[PDB]
Amino acid sequence: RGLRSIVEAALLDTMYDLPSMEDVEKVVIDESVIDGQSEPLLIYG
Amino acid sequence: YNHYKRLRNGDTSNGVELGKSNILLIGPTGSGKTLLAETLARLLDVPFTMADATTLTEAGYVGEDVENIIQKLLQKSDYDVQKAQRGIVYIDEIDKISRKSDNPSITRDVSGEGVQQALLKLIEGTVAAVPPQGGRKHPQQEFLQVDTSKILFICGGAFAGLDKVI
Amino acid sequence: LPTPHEIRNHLDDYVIGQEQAKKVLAVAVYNHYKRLRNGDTSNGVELGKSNILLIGPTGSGKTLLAETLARLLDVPFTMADATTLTEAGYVGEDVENIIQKLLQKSDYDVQKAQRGIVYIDEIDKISRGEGVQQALLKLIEGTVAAVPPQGGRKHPQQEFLQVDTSKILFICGGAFAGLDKVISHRVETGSGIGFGATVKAKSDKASEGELLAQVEPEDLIKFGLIPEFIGRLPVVATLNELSEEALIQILKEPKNALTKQYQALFNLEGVDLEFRDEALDAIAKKAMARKTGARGLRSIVEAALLDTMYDLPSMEDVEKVVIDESVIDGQSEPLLIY
Amino acid sequence: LTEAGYVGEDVENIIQKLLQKSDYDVQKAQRGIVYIDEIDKISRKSDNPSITRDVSGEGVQQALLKLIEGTVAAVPPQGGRKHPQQEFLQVDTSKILFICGGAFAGLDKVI
Amino acid sequence: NELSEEALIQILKEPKNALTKQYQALFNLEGVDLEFRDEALDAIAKKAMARKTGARGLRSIVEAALLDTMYDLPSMEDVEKVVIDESVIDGQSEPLLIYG
Amino acid sequence: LTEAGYVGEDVENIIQKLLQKSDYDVQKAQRGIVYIDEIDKISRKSDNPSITRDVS
Amino acid sequence: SHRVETGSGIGFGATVKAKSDKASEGELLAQVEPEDLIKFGLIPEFIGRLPVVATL
Amino acid sequence: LVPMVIEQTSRGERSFDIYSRLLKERVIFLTGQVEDHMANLIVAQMLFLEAENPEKDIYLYINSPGGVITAGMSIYDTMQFIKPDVSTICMGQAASMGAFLLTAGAKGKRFCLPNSRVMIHQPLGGYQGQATDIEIHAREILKVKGRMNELMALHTGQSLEQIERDTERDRFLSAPEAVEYGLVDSILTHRN
Amino acid sequence: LVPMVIEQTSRGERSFDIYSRLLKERVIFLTGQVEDHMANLIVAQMLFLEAENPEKDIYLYINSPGGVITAGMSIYDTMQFIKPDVSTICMGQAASMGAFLLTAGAKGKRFCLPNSRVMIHQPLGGYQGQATDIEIHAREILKVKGRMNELMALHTGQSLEQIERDTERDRFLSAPEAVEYGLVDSILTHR
Ligand SMILES: Nc1ncnc2c1ncn2[C@@H]1O[C@H](COP(=O)(O)OP(=O)(O)O)[C@@H](O)[C@H]1O
Ligand SMILES: Nc1ncnc2c1ncn2[C@@H]1O[C@H](COP(=O)(O)OP(=O)(O)O)[C@@H](O)[C@H]1O
């Protein structure tokens, strides 16, 4: 059950702003996003 | 937003079964924890209710039962279990349920640890026998099978002293 | 919807010596009725309920102030006691039962029942059960409680009447005897044992009137009240005390005065009654020593008039009856006029 | 679950839940499977004398002692349609498999 | 996070169901306008912080400050608007009343 | 006496009993007297888990 | 009794109350008040509606 | 050692010392050689009782052979200052200082047991040094003698001249004789 | 054996010794010969009370036949250093050091019981050793004498010359005499 907390925290800000964004065809998550130093990459079509 | 998506995705065309994630609002008293819950009922389409954990007690005792939480949610839902299953719940004063310290549990704490043990199955999702209205659990057949698998829970409390632990 | 000043005038007829408290209740009740009267709520802003907190000594008129307001503005009135609900077992059933009692006088009408004025007393006793306060604050803040429809052998959950408590005015009266010491410590010198301390414990408590008027949330939390409960009681009304002279006024000045009640009973019998001023001080002095306030007045007068009430109907030729201080003591017999 | 004669739910209610899946068919229910979660919760609190009756604890275990091995449980015929003439259904749990499960917190200290 | 003195001032006017707007509407229906000066809002927040009551305490502070006017305003006439300032909070000066 | 709708009794029957004694005359019935003996036996008690409800 | 019992002192000049003259039901029920009746279980409103009290 | 006792209250059983338990009932024990340390303890007890109930009386049990005048005089001023009356009971004996405190009690409340012995004498002291210093201390002790005799006469009611002659040397007074002299009012022979 | 007193409040009941119960009311007891250990204890009470409330007055009951001068100065400096006004009440007697602390109390808050005896004298000291060391110690005690007389004159209000002649030898004083001299402000005869 701890896994759900880690994933939700990482994608918390992303999901908040993802609907407003336009033509977001794909999203990529890497180790840099888990610790928090980096932000998930957003690909625009 | 995710909750509405899960209800919107109730069809579940894909084999994957969307999971449920609960919220735990920890903040000092007077910070608007209760206000946040009240400000959602205005816009919330699904049934929403508020309760108090202090009143709740372990089953088999004179205090209360955790199943009564669903009764309040049924009042707003017109006692319709179909739509009540897609509701949201808020539990206040959850901090009082915590064990204090160095307890052997010989006393069989009811106000504390007992309440947590009963909520476990409730939060993750289990069928619950809910009386019609203003009734207590008994051998009578006056019960309503309600499923809490899709019912979100938001336990909010002021964990006084937690800062010292941190 | 009478103005607060008009409401105070009605209270002055039945209650005397608590003019300051009447002002607080008159303005507070006026706002509550004004919100109900202004049910249109055209502007988006939502009006918030204001709950009063009465702090006064025993037999000071807290309960009388509750029903007097309801008599002026016809609304159902119910009374409850914190000691009754301190069981801490299935508190939800008793709190909603209070609304059931109110509905009995409101013809089981949700709209009319919502305008009722609820009163509670002895709130200091629960302050220290902490758990019971957790349930009480929900009732004051506002909660929907289901009640059965006008009794009946049984009814389904659908027929159950749900009444919102947000529109009901709650008055949590109480008598905090030990709070005066807490206020003196915070406001006055923090010395009570030494040579320079003030130990003038004459029981007059004249300072208690103005001392309790300085009540703040700090003194309440020291008493044991939780901050959340205090926040739901923004308005505070404080009664100082009922003096010996004040009791004499209560005996005759009120409209439904105690003396008038007995005087009428004797008048229909065929003999008038006269209450000398000397007898009034004797009755007032006894009430002060007993510490019952105005409550003891009824018992003291009834006992004094019990002997005459037994023999006066059988007796005849008694043109008039008079009472004096000697009769109150019990050594003397009420004077009879022929 | 709690000991009999108390506000809490009785042990026999478990059979009622199993009769809802089998359309209240005793034959199909007698051969059914059962899973009892949170079994660790019903445990004596390291007090063998048990001064105060542990209806929620030790009491539940005693009630289940004869159910697991087999007992003629009594339940309402069809969801209590009408309380008169109950004619409680007789169900034997001698052939009903039971799978209890729970997280025994603190058992490592004992072992 | 815990509320700060600056936040308390915002809560008095910024919210849609702000405490100040509640009393303003209560007076507007009667026909008398109501206005609160920024000097008074700061003093109100300081009292709550001084007493540690928090956001809930704001209702009690406003009630005491307007207790005198609310009692006499319905009976009084020719009162077009009421002005409140920091002087009202401490109790040294009664709330200013505008006559039409 | 017990709560209404229960097997024990109904409080309202006390008035009906008074009528039988007075031959159902509303006029003289209102002038009757009632004596409720054993009033202390209905004293409020705390809730019991085993009991379904405290009718008395 | 718990409300009106003064208590027994310990000093030389105090008043000692022996069990012989401790108290009795007579002269004790006469001092009944509504607060004590509420503890027994009677509703406060019920007591208020009964001003006359005949104590045997 | 001191035996503990149990006091029953609404909260539940409570444990109290034998002396502390009696202190709750406004009873103070004056025992042993009067000194500065014990006197401040008695003074603290008096002030504490005054706050709890200034109307109720205080009972001082005196059983001691006397002591310092300065320490004993701090108790006398405390008794007269506080509003509640201080009842004085003589147990066993009451010497020079014990007798001054005994007679200093509230009028009508001073008591003495039948076998108690009350002894009164004049102040005694000494100094070593130069003649100039001796004169200073000699004048001081003489003033104290007049001060103590003046107060003793006020409470007992006897003239200052009689007190001076009687206290010139050790004088032992029985419980009945003390009543006539005025040091006490009544004798507690048996409980009534 | 100090007795135990129970303080009852809404929160609960607490048991305290007689001395600790009075400390809550800002009452400090000065008893016996002044010394470093007892003086340190009194100083700790003043600082503790200052932290609880720096505005409420502190009471000091003085009953002591003097003591070490160095220990006394610590108490005197502490009283003046802290903001709260330290009241002084003379019980029984107040010798040289006790009198200095008595008169050191806040102006208008110095009291004495009617039968109290106040005695003031010059410092006492002695040294054994070489003549050179004697002059060093002799100069030190004389500076302390002049310093103490200056402070006593300031609080009492009397002239320095008058204080020198009066303090040359033991001078026993009574409560009324102390009022006119300036050591105290008023007498607490009754409540
Ligand atoms: N930012 C805010 N704006 C408005 N009200 C607030 C705010 N923060 C707190 N409050 C007040 O807090 C109360 C609701 O939360 P509260 O009851 O204190 O929570 P809890 O019961 O969890 O301590 C109300 O009085 C509400 O007005
Ligand atoms: N000013 C007054 N005029 C007439 N009757 C009074 C007055 N003040 C008190 N009483 C009577 O005495 C009672 C006092 O007790 P009550 O108001 O019930 O308060 P409490 O419950 O604190 O004793 C009133 O209810 C009323 O019967």
What domain range includes position C262? 241-338
Q: Answer left, alpha or beta for residue B125, where phi above 0 means left and psi between -120 and 50 means alpha.
A: left
C/I interface, count of CB pairs below 8 Å: 41
> CA-to-CA distance for H76 and H102, rounded, in angstroms?
10
Residues contacting ligand 1 via CB (< 6 Å): B 29-35, 92, 156, 158; C 228; E 3, 11, 15, 55-56
What domain range includes position E24? 2-100
What DSSP string runs through C164-206?
Answer: EGGGSEEEE-B--STHHHHHHHHHS-S-SSSTTS-----S--H
**Residue I31 backbone phi and psi in degrees, to 5:** -140, 140
Closest CA to C98 of G45, B66, F42, F56: G45
Closest CA to I117 of I59, I157, I169, I62: I62
What DSSP string runs through F1-52?
Answer: ---TTSSS--TTHHHHHHHHHHTT-HHHHTT-------GGGG------SSSS
Token code pair at residue F51: 């009991």
After which residues does chain H have a break in its backbone, defined as C to next N over 2.5 Å?
none
> CA-to-CA distance for E65 and E62, rounded, in angstroms?
5
Token code pair at residue A36: 């928090």
CB C72 within 8 A of CB C115: no
Closest CA to D64 of D31, D87, D41, D86: D41
Q: Which of C63, C242, C243, C288 to mutate to test ligand 2, by most ligand atoms within 8 A of the CB atom?
A: C63
* CATH number 3.90.226.10 is the correct assignment for the domain at I4-187: yes
Number of domains in chain E: 1
CB I66 within 8 A of CB I88: no
Sequence-distant (6+) residues with CB within 8 A of C241 are C57, C60, C205, C206, C208, C209
Axis-axis angle for helices C295-311, C258-269 (nearest 10): 10
Number of domains in chain C: 2
Residue C57 labeled ligand binder: yes
> CA-to-CA distance for I105 and I83, rounded, in angstroms?
12
Catalytic residues of I: 96, 121, 170
Strand ranges (DSSP E) for chain I?
4-8, 13-17, 27-31, 58-64, 86-94, 110-112, 117-120, 171-174, 186-187
> CA-to-CA distance for E53 and E60, rounded, in angstroms?
10
Longest dimension (CA), chain I: 69
Three-class secondary structure of residue E33 per DSSP: strand
Dihedral of the CA atoms C78, C83, C89, C92 (nearest 10)? Answer: 20
Return the bridge partners of A26, or none: A43
Closest CA to D73 of D50, D87, D91: D91
C240, C264, C298 — which closes off a domain?
Answer: C240
> CA-to-CA distance for I108 and C253, rounded, in angstroms?
50
Q: Answer left, alpha or beta for residue H113, where phi above 0 means left and psi between -120 and 50 means alpha.
A: beta
Closest CA to I97 of I28, I162, I157, I31: I31
CB-CB neighbors (< 8 A) of B30 in chain C: 227, 231
CB contact under 8 A, C197 and H51: yes
> CA-to-CA distance for C15 and C253, rounded, in angstroms?
9
Dihedral of the CA atoms B30, B31, B36, B37 (nearest 10)? Answer: -50
In what helix (H) or strand (E) does residue H154 lie, and over which residues does it extend?
helix H131-156
> CA-to-CA distance for H100 and H95, rounded, in angstroms?
8
CB B137 within 8 A of CB B81: no
CB B110 within 8 A of CB B94: no
CB-CB neighbors (< 8 A) of B139 in chain D: 10
Closest CA to B128 of B114, B154, B148, B142: B148
Closest CA to C70 of C140, C201, C171: C171
Closest CA to F46 of H133, I106, G39: G39
Shortest Cα–Cα distance, E22 to chain C (Å): 5
Instruction: Using the Cα atoms of residue C190, residue C192, residue C195 and residue C199 in order, give the sign of their dihedral.
Output: positive
CB atoms within 10 A of CB G41: 13
Token code pair at residue I131: 């003549």
Residue C192 labeled ligand binder: no
Shared domain for C53 and C170, answered yes or no, is yes
F46 touches D: beta carbon within 8 Å: no
Angle at the Cα of H154 (from H153 to H157), degrees rounded to 5?
A: 70
Return the bridge partners of B7, or none: none
Dihedral of the CA atoms B99, B101, B107, B109 (nearest 10)? Answer: 0
Axis-axis angle for helices C295-311, C244-252 (nearest 10): 50
**Ligand 2 center to residue E70 CA distance, Å?**
27
Shortest Cα–Cα distance, B143 to chain E (Å): 40
CB B54 within 8 A of CB B111: yes
SS3 assignment for G1-14 = CCCCCCCCCCCCCC
> CA-to-CA distance for I31 and H68, rounded, in angstroms?
14
Using a threshold of 3 CB pairs under 8 A, tell whether chains D and E touch: no
> CA-to-CA distance for I146 and H37, rounded, in angstroms?
32
> CA-to-CA distance for H3 and H1, rounded, in angstroms?
6
**Ligand 2 center to residue H191 CA distance, Å?**
45
Query: Ligand 2 atom 8: the closest Cα is on which residue?
Result: C61
**Beta carbon of C121 within 6 Å of any ligand 2 atom:** yes
Residue B32 labeled ligand binder: yes
Instruction: Give the residue carrying structure tokens 């009198």.
Output: I99
Nearest CA in chain B to D74: B139
CB I100 within 8 A of CB I156: no
CB I18 within 8 A of CB I5: yes
> CA-to-CA distance for H62 and H112, rounded, in angstroms?
9
Q: Answer left, alpha or beta for residue H157, where phi above 0 means left and psi between -120 and 50 means alpha.
A: left
Query: Ligand 1 atom 4: the closest Cα is on which residue?
Result: E11
Sequence-distant (6+) residues with CB within 8 A of I12 are none
Three-class secondary structure of residue A24 per DSSP: strand
Shortest Cα–Cα distance, H184 to chain G (Å): 15
Catalytic residues of H: 96, 121, 170
E15 touches B: beta carbon within 8 Å: no
What domain range includes position B42? 1-166
Nearest CA in chain F to D6: F50
I23 touches C: beta carbon within 8 Å: no
In what helix (H) or strand (E) does residue B83 lie, and over which residues does it extend?
helix B81-84
Sequence-distant (6+) residues with CB within 8 A of I86 are I46, I57, I58, I59, I60, I79, I104, I105, I106, I109
**Beta carbon of C286 within 6 Å of any ligand 2 atom:** no
C84 touches G: beta carbon within 8 Å: yes
Token code pair at residue C94: 């008793």
CB C241 within 8 A of CB C20: no
CB contact under 8 A, C151 and F4: yes
Substitution target from G38, G42, G47, G56 for chain F, most F beta carbons within 10 A: G42
> CA-to-CA distance for H167 and E13, rounded, in angstroms?
85
Number of domains in chain B: 1
> CA-to-CA distance for C80 and C65, rounded, in angstroms?
15
Instruction: Name the structure determination technique.
Output: cryo-EM
In what helix (H) or strand (E) does residue H115 lie, and over which residues does it extend?
none
